[PDB]
Write a protein that binds this ligand. Sequence first.
Ligand SMILES: Nc1ncnc2c1ncn2[C@@H]1O[C@H](COP(=O)(O)OP(=O)(O)O)[C@@H](O)[C@H]1O
Ligand SMILES: Nc1ncnc2c1ncn2[C@@H]1O[C@H](COP(=O)(O)OP(=O)(O)O)[C@@H](O)[C@H]1O
Lengths: 303, 305
Amino acid sequence: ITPYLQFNRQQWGNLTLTESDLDKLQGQIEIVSLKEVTEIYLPLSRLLSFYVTARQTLQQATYQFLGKPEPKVPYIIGIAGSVAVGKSTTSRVLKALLSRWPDHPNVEVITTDGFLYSNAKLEKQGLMKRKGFPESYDMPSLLRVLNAIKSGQRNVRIPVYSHHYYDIVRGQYEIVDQPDIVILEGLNILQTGVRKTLQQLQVFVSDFFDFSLFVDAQAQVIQKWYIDRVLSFWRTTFKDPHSYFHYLTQMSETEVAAFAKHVWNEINKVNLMENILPYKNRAQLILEKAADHSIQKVYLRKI
Amino acid sequence: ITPYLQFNRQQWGNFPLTLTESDLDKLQGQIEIVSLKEVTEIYLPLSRLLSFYVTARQTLQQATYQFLGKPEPKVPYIIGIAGSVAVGKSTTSRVLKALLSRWPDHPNVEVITTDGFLYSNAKLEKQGLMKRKGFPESYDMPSLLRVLNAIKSGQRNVRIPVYSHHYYDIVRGQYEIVDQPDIVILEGLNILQTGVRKTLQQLQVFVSDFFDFSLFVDAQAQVIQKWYIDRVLSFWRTTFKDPHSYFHYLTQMSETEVAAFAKHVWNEINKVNLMENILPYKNRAQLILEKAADHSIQKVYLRKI
Ligand SMILES: Nc1ncnc2c1ncn2[C@@H]1O[C@H](COP(=O)(O)OP(=O)(O)O)[C@@H](O)[C@H]1O
Ligand SMILES: Nc1ncnc2c1ncn2[C@@H]1O[C@H](COP(=O)(O)OP(=O)(O)O)[C@@H](O)[C@H]1O
C-alpha cells in the first residue's frame, strides 16, 4: 500500500529538445547530459506543466465564479534534498525546460541559502559549523518573501548568498516579480518552524508552495558528489585569493578530500539525517538518483 | 500583503445555485440548525467553489495518468475541516457532505471525524491525560496517519474507529467504512498540527500531507465559549438524563452549577487547547470561515491561487 505512483526509468520513458532549450540549458547540459535531460527532465517538465496549467485553469474558473478580478499568483515548486544532491542543478534544468511552455514562460529560482544568517551573526551565536541547519536561517524573512509572492506582491527582493565568499552578500538582491512559476530550492523547505511559544502562529514553507520534489540518493553517494564538488572548486574557484576557502588551495588534493569528508560527516550528513531526510515523504515527487546522477526511480503522489 | 482573497457576506453572495428537494432531504436535521438562508447563501456556493477544486483534481488525474501511462484509478479528494471545540465543524462537515454530493462528478462523499482516533478513556487515564482530551497527546496519531495513508493509497474499505460523545469514549469494535469515495471530509481539532519528534531522525508526515484543501472555522473565543456552554447545557436537559451517559452525574448539578462546570472545562481545557494547538495553525488553512455570534458566516478568507 503506497500513496505514490512508482516509475523505474523504462516506465518513465512512456516531446523533443529545441535549439531554444539547448541554449537555456547551456553549461548545464554538459553536467547533466543530453540523454538525461531528454529522457528525464523534459518529461518531468511536461508533467509539472500539467499541474501548473491545471492551477491556472482553476484560478480562472474560480475567480470568475467568485467574481474576483485579482490576478493569479505564482505556482511554486519546491526542490528539496541533501547538500550536494543536485537541488541547484535540477532547479536550473527545470527552470530552462518549464519556460518552453507558453502558459508559463516566466520561471524563477529562489534558493533558501540567501536566507542564511550572515557569518558574523552565526559566529556570534556559535553556529558557523551549523550552516544549513534550521537555526542558521532567518525564517521570518523567508516566510515574509514567500508570503509576499503568494499575496501577489510585485518586485519581491530576494537576498543572495555567495558560496564563493561563504556568506550573505550585503545589499544584494535578486528580483522575483510575479512570474508564472517559482522553483524554491533549499535543504529546509519541507521542515516546520521552531515554536518559540505554544501560542505563536505557525506556518511552514510548504504552506506557500504547490508541489515539492525531493532529490534522493544514498548518503555515501552524495558524500562523493560533495567531496568532488569541493575538489572541483579547489581546482578552480578557490584559487581566487578573495575566496573564503582560499586556504584549502595550500592543501594537497588528499588533504582537501579528507577535509571535505570531515565537513560532510560532522555537518552536512548530520543535517541530512536530522533535518532533511525525515521530511522526505512530504514531497509530492521523489527523484531517486544512482551514483552517476542518473534518475533510476521516480515517486509521484497519487491523485 | 495578504495571501487570501477576502469576502464579507455581500461579496460572498456576489458569486444557478438553488437548493433542490434532494438537497433538502439530505440536509434533514441540519437545515433546522443552520437555517435555509445560511445554507443557501453560504454553504451551497461554498460547496460549488469546492467542487471546482475536486473536479480540477479529477481532470488533472485523468490527463497526467494518460501522459504517465498509468492505469491506476484516482484516489479521493480530501477536504480538512479544523477549528475549536464547539465552533461548528461537525455541523459544517455534514452540510458540505450533503451539498458536495449533489454534483455528478463526485456524488460519493464521506466524513471522517478525528475524534475516532482519540485514545480510549482507559488509556488516557493510565497516562493522566483525561484532562487533555483533544490535545495532541490524546490522539492515536499513527492510526490516523495509517488511515489517511491508506485512503490516499487507493485502499478499499478502510475502517474508521468511532467515538461516542454520549459515552465520552471510543466505541470498541465499531467502525465506519470509507470506500474510495470521491471526497473525504476530514474534520477534527488537530488536522493542521504536526507530529511530535520522538527522535530527530524519525520520519515525519503531517495529516495535511494527506489532504488537498482545508477549511478553518473561526470565531471569537468568548463566542465559542457560549456555544460550548449552551451545547453542554442542552445535553444536560436531554442526552445526559440517560443513566448510562458519561456525564450523567452532571444532572445532579443545578442549571447554574453545570454552567459553571462548563465554563471551567472550556477555560481550563478546551480554550487552552484552542490557544495552544488549534489557533496557532489557523493560517495553514486554504479557507477560513469566520462566524459571528449567531453562527452566520461574516467573513471568508480563501488562499489566492
Ligand atoms: N543530474 C546531474 N548529473 C550530473 N552531475 C550532477 C547532476 N546534478 C548535480 N550534479 C553535480 O553534483 C554536485 C551537486 O550539485 P548541486 O546542484 O550543486 O547540489 P545542491 O544544490 O543540492 O547542493 C555538483 O558538482 C553538480 O555539478
Ligand atoms: N452554522 C450553524 N448555525 C447554527 N448553529 C450551529 C452552526 N454550526 C454549529 N452550530 C451549533 O453550535 C454547536 C457546535 O457545533 P458542532 O458542529 O457540534 O461543533 P464542533 O463539531 O466543532 O464541536 C452545536 O450546538 C451546533 O448545533
